Amino acid sequence: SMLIFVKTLTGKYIELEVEPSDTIENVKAKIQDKEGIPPDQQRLAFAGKSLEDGRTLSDYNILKDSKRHPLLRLR
Amino acid sequence: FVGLRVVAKWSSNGYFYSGKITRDVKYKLLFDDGYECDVLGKDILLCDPIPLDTEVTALSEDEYFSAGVVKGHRKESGELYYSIEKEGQRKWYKRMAVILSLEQGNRLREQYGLG
């Protein structure tokens, strides 16, 4: 597992555990599960880069070591 | 405790986030992240600012949270900045970029925990 954070457009922080093999779709589903935001309406970005459907987190070089927890932002 | 600044978690194994007590009911908390929420006093640390040498988690400019140690405080325009050291390097962080892990908050409960 690895910890990531997600900031909503409400400004609220969410915490998720993910695997580097998780796809963007899986993440949006977790956001839906925790916040009730439809996948279809979530535009996830990391450091201003849009995260596209059917890639993994590892495809974007988001996930480093366990000590560093990336903040994804909804836009 | 109303009007007081606080760091508090809202989930059993979550992080502690900075906010304000808006009402005693559990306590009604407005988090600096804008989320409003009634949280147990058990989960509220009444420290403000987070004291020197506390181990915290802070959002770096590269959009990673990671652990560091509070080394200083600065209050400008009413806003609080923390100087936080990470592997020997110090940077300044806005209050809302500094949170506590469950373990990091647990270490403050005895001294600062509400109750």
Residue numbers in the entry:
A (entry chain B): 0 to 74
B (entry chain A): 1486 to 1510, 1514 to 1603
Authors' description from the paper:
Using these classifications, we determined that the addition of i53 variants results in an increase of HDR by specifically reducing NHEJ events but not MMEJ nor other types of outcomes, consistent to their role as 53BP1 antagonists.
To understand the molecular basis of the improved activity and binding of the de novo i53 variants identified in our screens, we solved crystal structures of each variant bound to 53BP1 (S2.2, S2.3, S2.4, S2.5 and S2.6). We observed that the L67R change enables a new 2.8 Å H-bond with D1550 of 53BP1, and that L67H forms a network of inter- and intramolecular H-bonds, including a water mediated H-bond to S1554 of 53BP1 and an H-bond to D64 on i53. For the T12Y.T14E.L67R structure, T14E forms a 2.6 Å H-bond to Y1502 and a 2.9 Å H-bond to the backbone amide of Y1500. The T12Y mutation forms additional Van der Waals contacts at the protein-protein interface.
